[PDB]
């Protein structure tokens, strides 16, 4: 169970990238240290690669979350794109979390 709040942003990749970028700025402006587990940082305070396959997601997610807690992040945004079933895999491997439609 990660200490940080977990937010999964799902939808087509194009929309997810825009939504995550938006959320990071919002969280930062509010004073929250934010981390992103995805395909890129979107300029978050912390970043950890999610993986590009369902198998990689299942393998890296918890390692990523441990990294985030060790870093003291307040909120972790997990990229959940529709393409290649990454978002579904994220939710499957995922205590409590929020889901945001991109």
| Domain of residue 95, CATH code | 3.40.50.11030
Number of H helices, E strands in the chain: 3, 5
Q: CA-CA distance, 39 to 33, in Å (whole number)?
A: 19
Note whether 46 and 68 are within 8 A (CB). Answer: yes
Q: CA dihedral in degrees (87, 37, 98, 59; nearest 10)?
A: 60
C-alpha closest to that of 50 among 16, 101, 5, 95:
16
DSSP E strands: which ranges in 3-101?
5-11, 34-38, 46-49, 75-81, 98-101
The count of domains in the chain is 1
Resolution for the entry shown, Å = 2.0
Chain breaks in the chain (C to N over 2.5 A) after: 94
Domain that holds residue 84: 1-102
Q: Rounded to an integer, what distance in angstroms lies between the CA atom of residue 55 and that of residue 15?
A: 23
Neighbours of 95 (CB within 10 A): 7
The candidate with the shortest Cα–Cα distance to 49, out of 12, 86, 85, is 86
């Amino acid at each position: 169970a990660p200490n940080a709040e977990v937010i999964v942003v799902e939808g087509p990749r194009e929309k997810v990238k825009g939504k995550i970028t938006e959320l990071v700025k919002e969280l930062k402006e509010r004073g929250k240290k934010v981390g992103v587990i995805g395909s890129e940082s979107y300029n978050a305070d912390e970043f950890f690669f999610l993986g590009s396959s369902v198998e990689e997601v299942a393998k890296n997610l918890f390692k990523a979350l441990r990294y985030m807690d060790k870093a003291g992040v307040d909120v972790v945004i997990a990229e959940g794109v529709e393409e290649r079933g990454l978002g579904l895999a994220v939710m499957n491997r995922l205590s409590g979390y929020k889901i945001v439609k991109a």
